[PDB]
Design a protein around this ligand. Sequence first.
Ligand SMILES: Nc1ncnc2c1ncn2[C@@H]1O[C@H](COP(=O)(O)OP(=O)(O)O)[C@@H](O)[C@H]1O
Ligand code: BEF
Lengths: 97, 878
Amino acid sequence: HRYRPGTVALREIRRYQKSTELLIRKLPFQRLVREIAQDFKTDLRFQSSAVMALQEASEAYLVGLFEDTNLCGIHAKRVTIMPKDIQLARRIRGERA
Amino acid sequence: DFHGIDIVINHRLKTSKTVPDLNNCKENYEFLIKWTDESHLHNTWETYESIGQVRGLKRLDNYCKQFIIEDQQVRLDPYVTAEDIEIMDMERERRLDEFEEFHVPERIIDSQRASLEDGTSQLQYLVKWRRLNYDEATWENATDIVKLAPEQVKHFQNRENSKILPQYSSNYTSQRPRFEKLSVQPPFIKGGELRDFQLTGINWMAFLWSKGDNGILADEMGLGKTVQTVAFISWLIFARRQNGPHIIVVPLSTMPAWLDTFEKWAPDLNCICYMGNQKSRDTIREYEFYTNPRAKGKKTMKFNVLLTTYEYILKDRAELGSIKWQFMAVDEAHRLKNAESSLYESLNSFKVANRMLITGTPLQNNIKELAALVNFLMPGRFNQDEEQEEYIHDLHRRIQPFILRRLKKDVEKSLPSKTERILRVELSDVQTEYYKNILTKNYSALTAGAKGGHFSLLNIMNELKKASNHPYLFDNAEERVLQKFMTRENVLRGLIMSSGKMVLLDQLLTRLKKDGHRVLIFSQMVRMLDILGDYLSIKGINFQRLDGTVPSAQRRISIDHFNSPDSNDFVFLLSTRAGGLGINLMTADTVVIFDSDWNPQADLQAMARAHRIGQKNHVMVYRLVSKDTVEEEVLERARKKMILEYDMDSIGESEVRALYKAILKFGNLKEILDELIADGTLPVKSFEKYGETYDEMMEAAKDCVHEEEKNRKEILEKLEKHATAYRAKLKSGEIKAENQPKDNPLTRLSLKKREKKAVLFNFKGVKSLNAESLLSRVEDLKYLKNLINSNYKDDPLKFSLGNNTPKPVQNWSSNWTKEEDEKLLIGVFKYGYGSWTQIRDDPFLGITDKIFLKKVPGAIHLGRRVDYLLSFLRGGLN
DNA sequence: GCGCGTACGTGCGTTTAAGCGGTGCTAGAGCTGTCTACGACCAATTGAGCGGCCTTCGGCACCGGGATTCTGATGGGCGGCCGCGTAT
DNA sequence: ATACGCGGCCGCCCATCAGAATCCCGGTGCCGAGGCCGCTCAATTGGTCGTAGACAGCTCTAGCACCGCTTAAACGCACGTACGCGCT
Ligand SMILES: Nc1ncnc2c1ncn2[C@@H]1O[C@H](COP(=O)(O)OP(=O)(O)O)[C@@H](O)[C@H]1O
Ligand code: BEF
């Protein structure tokens, strides 16, 4: 496999693409919601899927984010996603001010 | 693969201030180092300038770091008490105890002859060590293997030789052999004698064994249930000749018991388990097969019995599914409770013939399991006030067969008595606050209001129940009852006080404390157990905890430490499912219950671990029933729940080719009939059929031998008769001595006597069988077997030549002297003629680098060597 | 950070075409007015559609039997052992 | 006292019988169209009434076009400064 410099960097990427499993765990996420959902109302219940569905939404939501972030990052002469790279992306999409 | 550091064992001083620096350890400390990829046994006292940069530097440095500070906390500080000195030293003591047991070997896995750099080949054994799993078994040569553990090697040979594999089992598939009621205890129970309720149990299992039906063992919690299966396994093996690899699945908690329970009640069948991970996975397969891979299902077969944890079933469902099994054992088979289980249809795929569950699971709680058990043992086979008689007419008549119900009324006559007392504890101060406020969101939302939301139902019917007696199970409880703002007395007092149960327990505990009873605490919740972990240490009572979070090795150490004759700790705390998991406690008398275990019967076994056949101190049980709470009601439902509790044709030429070689190798082979058949050498035929063929084969051998001798004998007389006639002429001068004919009788006679030609015959199979070769070795070995037997019996090797002189072998490559011959003979006496690697490798012989099978002597040289010695000392060359 | 390069901002003069209010013209939106076709509604009969329930052959990947090739003890015959041994 | 005989040992080429391994034929499990089907409640069928909306007439806004006086805005070019972007 050639040498070692930036060897995995592109490798993991590819394997992750071929797959289609959830990027983030499905146990911490499950409480995260239960916990905030309480603050806006009491005595809450949850459909098995409802979360499954959120996970799907969210994950997908972030990737998408990163996907631009990357571009921005490239624009900059950089291969590094940065704390702001996040902001511009959002700002111009418009949720971020 | 390199010589690098693996671990730390021992630390000591190297040489004759306030804190030792690393230099001090380097110039004043010697440390025992275990090397990488190498057993424990080769450990070296080495420093840093001694070895230099070696791969692996990390563990010593830290361990030295641990060492430096350790030195400051035993001798170099006055805040240290009496007790820390006890622990800081103690560690040294235990750290070595877990290191010592690796030196003792526990099983030899296989034997490989591998070559060395001096051109030599030496035998090595794959050695397995004590209380460790199949990994890191490294090869060690045989020289010292028997020099430290002779017993292992003796047994190592025995299994390989004891041809009793699943290769010869009787065809009773179609139909069975009529079976017999046993009176006596089978000559296969070395562990002892059982009683009058362990042999009959066995006679039913084996009794419906011959029906083609499977059965349920439903006896009390510990009526030698395990002995009944092991003996059941033993008598189905030397009764109906079943070598059929029996599969047994037991709990990860209860197997170590079983092994010893299997290796002490029945020596002769070996018991190889399944308890590893990745590496093991391979070693199991190393011995699980013969000759690497195998066409079809032609595995030669190297086990019968196994033990499997419930994990491992499901992780590798597939490989067992393929291999056939016809007998099943399982431990505490209440698992198959629902008919939607994963192991519930996992077990059904394993081609099987008979099953065997053995648990005391009550079978009226739900009718599901009652049916599930019946559906599982027998796939296919399956109220009203006035039809109930009609109903149990159907249920009693059908259910019984595959069922066993039998009371203690046995072995309990010796064992000291059983007893249980309830406890009515009423509520406290801070208690009502959280018995009252919690059933609303008044002050439950003021303090910890964010969490209120999720626990709100938890707290109602599956907490209040659990958080009724003790409110200390959340956050805003600890300072609630402590009325002040470090105090040590108050914390102890403040915690004992809040609960009705804590005080009641503290006083009873004290009450028996001075009288002398060992007390048990079974709590439902993990944390309660830390809670107490925190209090009892403080007030100085020696204990250990028994949770759901502990390595098999660590679990095992303490359980034994506890049942030993002189153990200080009379306090031991356990779990409901984790506590009653398995095991037994035989020293313990008292057991106390904090809260009922949301159900009837989880407690009944929970006391079963302590109340067993052994206990000689009666028994004592306390149940802390909360008053004016929610504990009460379940207790009543619990009651509702437990209301009901109910000839091979002839021998062909190839065998005749098989038998002839075996005689040259072993001599009379009539005694050894089965051992050869078990392994490749012989087909399965009745004992006589071979024995008669063995005898006529020599009978054919001698007749040809004599007939030939007679004929030459008759001619030889005729030639000498002529020979004398010439002799008269020779001294008379008619023919002169220095001018006598080319051909004349003297020459004819000479060639005739010096006749050299093998003697031959047929035997309805072989071509031109050697008549003399067979007769000569049969007798010579008979003689050597006879003399050493009657003078050197107890120890073979002492065998001596004494004066008698057999030829010197000057020019052979290696040292050859009379002692070497002494062993050479014993070697065949032990292994047979013609197998010489066997003889050369043997640790006992000591001939290992004097044999070379340009280097002499090789295989024929020895072959030449024995025939000459054996004839020589009987006087054969006469 | 720094340094090189150059392109893009700022200016003036030249130049080009928008914006303004002026008129004229008629097209196409918006209104208006009568008819009647096509969609809603109510009826009664009929099978497409949904839950409930279990089917069969073909394809991936593990498999099966028979002739054939390579390794091991066997064996008479020509040679060599130089060292104990009987006969004169 | 002195010389001849030989004896198993051994390298040699030369012979026999079993075991290993490749090719000739294979069974097995998984996936995806199929079939069966049946109680039935939504679409279809035959049918009446009435009303939107097509359609023809009409008039009456506003979108187009067109022109010329006036001029602000665009244009193009000249000059240099202060950034884009390249390197380290
Ligand atoms: N039938 C028996 N005969 C002799 N000894 C027994 C018998 N049953 C049990 N024992 C002894 O009692 C101990 C535990 O046996 P048992 O009570 O059946 O196991 P468990 O804890 O599973 O019930 C063992 O150490 C064994 O020596
Ligand atoms: F019968 Be037991 F608890 F192994």
